[PDB]
Write an enzyme that holds these catalytic residues in place. Structure first.
Site, PDB file in Angstrom:
ATOM      1  N   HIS A  44       0.823  -1.215   0.000  1.00 42.63           N
ATOM      2  CA  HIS A  44       0.000   0.000   0.000  1.00 42.63           C
ATOM      3  C   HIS A  44       0.859   1.267   0.000  1.00 42.63           C
ATOM      4  CE1 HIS A  44      -3.743  -2.137   0.414  1.00 42.63           C
ATOM      5  NE2 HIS A  44      -3.403  -2.665   1.576  1.00 42.63           N
TER       6      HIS A  44
ATOM      7  N   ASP B 163      -2.335 -10.850  -2.280  1.00 43.71           N
ATOM      8  CA  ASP B 163      -2.943 -10.252  -1.100  1.00 43.71           C
ATOM      9  C   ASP B 163      -4.367  -9.873  -1.492  1.00 43.71           C
ATOM     10  OD1 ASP B 163      -3.778  -7.781   0.579  1.00 43.71           O
ATOM     11  OD2 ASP B 163      -2.037  -8.586   1.689  1.00 43.71           O
TER      12      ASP B 163
HETATM   13  N1  LIG Z   1     -12.364   0.526   8.975  1.00 43.83           N
HETATM   14  C1  LIG Z   1     -11.165   0.682   8.176  1.00 43.83           C
HETATM   15  C2  LIG Z   1     -10.651  -0.702   7.695  1.00 43.83           C
HETATM   16  C3  LIG Z   1      -9.258  -0.598   7.006  1.00 43.83           C
HETATM   17  N2  LIG Z   1      -8.633  -1.905   6.930  1.00 43.83           N
HETATM   18  C4  LIG Z   1      -7.268  -1.765   6.527  1.00 43.83           C
HETATM   19  C5  LIG Z   1      -6.771  -3.041   5.828  1.00 43.83           C
HETATM   20  C6  LIG Z   1      -5.270  -3.003   5.540  1.00 43.83           C
HETATM   21  C7  LIG Z   1      -4.804  -4.175   4.682  1.00 43.83           C
HETATM   22  C8  LIG Z   1      -3.287  -4.252   4.626  1.00 43.83           C
HETATM   23  C9  LIG Z   1      -2.794  -5.345   3.694  1.00 43.83           C
HETATM   24  O1  LIG Z   1      -3.316  -6.575   4.142  1.00 43.83           O
HETATM   25  O2  LIG Z   1      -3.202  -5.097   2.364  1.00 43.83           O
HETATM   26  C10 LIG Z   1      -1.275  -5.398   3.694  1.00 43.83           C
HETATM   27  F1  LIG Z   1      -0.891  -6.280   2.766  1.00 43.83           F
HETATM   28  F2  LIG Z   1      -0.751  -4.207   3.398  1.00 43.83           F
HETATM   29  F3  LIG Z   1      -0.844  -5.776   4.894  1.00 43.83           F
HETATM   30  K   LIG Z   2      -3.704  -7.989  -4.495  1.00 41.30           K
HETATM   31 ZN   LIG Z   3      -4.238  -7.272   2.585  1.00 41.36          ZN
END
Ligand SMILES: NCCCNCCCCCC(O)(O)C(F)(F)F
Ligand SMILES: [K+]
Ligand SMILES: [Zn+2]
Ligand SMILES: [Br-]
Ligand SMILES: [Br-]
Ligand SMILES: [Br-]
Ligand SMILES: [K+]
Length: 356
Positions: free
Chosen positions: A132, A170
């Protein structure tokens, strides 16, 4: 031989306000432990972790971003809280910067080992994740874009135009990775992700199938967006069969990087999908037929500790030459997934002759 990097120091990154935040330190210790349990660890060649240098970070990130994240290292808690809240979905502790340097540096060493022929392939059990992260900002648990940086590092120790493929399975779109390479025809970015017409994190329409790249990068960005259903092994096997693999063969990468999040896994609290460990094994196995077996598997997301441990161990098992486990009988795919795969097929048929 298969390489493996893991360093417990990367556990040091933590959420001092919400200790139960899903991006847990034990994500990496648990995966490593499962490798011991399955006696996969001793079958691998241990690759050392090291710190990325600021110069290496500059391969993908602006001086400003590098500088501010670096400053968090000596910040007091209240300032850490402020700084993190300025980003979309970030927590920061005094150890965060160093851990992110270790994550990237571990992957540089693994790519180096693969490209020099010291190992054939490798897994990297690292955190915080990376995909990200943008050139100029942190996002979604990520500080620096590890896989993107590893790609540039790879080219830096070979030739500039080294064809690197990045498969991002992912469950979230790697917005940072797409953007960093969007005008680049030497790095092919292919992401599968839960999309839900832009409603699923990171909530940008950049993740839709019609985003195919820009300038000389046109055709070298492939988004496979899932909408509606609970996607599992059949949907992912079909997307690899119809899209990912033939595009990959035509591109003929010299190095494959997997942004291997395991949050599409059965059991994940965030992803809502049901890819099995066997599924991840088969995806791994297929990718192994590319780039003369040169595959680096890099941990991204995935938040069910049991699920990600079993899933990534199965990948490593494949990289070690074990035969693929048998898949469950592949149900006809969800009609939504058929529509998705056809959209991508139509969007990339002009750039890839294998798709027509
Ligand atoms: N209420 C807000 C919910 C937001 N949720 C965020 C999810 C992040 C995912 C991170 C990921 O899994 O993509 C990484 F690979 F970068 F670790
Ligand atoms: K992906
Ligand atoms: Zn993720
Ligand atoms: Br969350
Ligand atoms: Br072992
Ligand atoms: Br989410
Ligand atoms: K690209």
């Amino acid at each position: 031989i298969t390489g493996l990097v893991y360093d417990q120091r990367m556990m040091l990154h933590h959420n001092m306000w919400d200790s139960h935040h899903p991006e847990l330190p034990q994500r990496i210790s648990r995966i490593f432990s499962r490798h011991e349990e399955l006696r996969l660890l001793s079958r691998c060649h241990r690759i050392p972790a090291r710190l990325a240098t600021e110069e290496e970070l500059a391969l993908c990130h602006s001086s400003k971003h590098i500088s501010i994240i670096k400053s968090s290292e000596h910040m007091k808690p209240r300032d850490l809280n402020r700084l993190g809240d300025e980003y979309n979905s970030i927590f920061i502790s005094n150890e965060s910067y160093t851990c992110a340097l270790l994550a990237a540096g571990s992957c540089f060493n693994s790519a180096q080992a693969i490209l020099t022929g010291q190992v054939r392939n490798a897994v990297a059990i690292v955190r915080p994740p990376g995909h990200h992260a943008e050139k100029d900002t942190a996002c979604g648990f990520c500080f620096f874009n590890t896989a993107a940086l590893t790609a540039r590092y790879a080219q830096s120790i070979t030739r500039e135009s080294l064809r690197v493929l990045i498969v991002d399975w992912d469950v979230h779109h790697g917005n940072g990775t797409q953007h960093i390479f969007e005008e680049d025809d030497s790095v092919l970015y292919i992401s599968l992700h839960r999309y839900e017409d832009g409603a699923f994190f990171p909530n940008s329409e950049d993740a839709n199938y019609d985003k195919v790249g820009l300038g000389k990068g046109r055709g070298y960005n492939v988004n496979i967006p899932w909408n509606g259903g609970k996607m599992g092994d059949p949907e992912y096997m079909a997307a690899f069969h119809h899209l990912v693999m033939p595009i990959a063969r035509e591109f003929a990468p010299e190095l494959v990087l997997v942004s291997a999040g395991f949050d599409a896994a059965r059991g994940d609290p965030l992803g809502g999908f049901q890819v099995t460990p066997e599924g991840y094994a088969h995806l791994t196995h297929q990718l192994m037929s590319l780039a003369a077996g040169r595959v680096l598997i890099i941990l991204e997301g995935g938040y069910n500790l049991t699920s990600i441990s079993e899933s990534m161990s199965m990948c490593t098992s494949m990289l070690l030459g074990d035969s693929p486990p048998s898949l469950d009988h592949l149900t006809p795919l969800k009609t939504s997934a058929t529509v998705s795969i056809n959209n991508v097929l139509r969007a990339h048929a002009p750039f890839w002759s294998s798709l027509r």
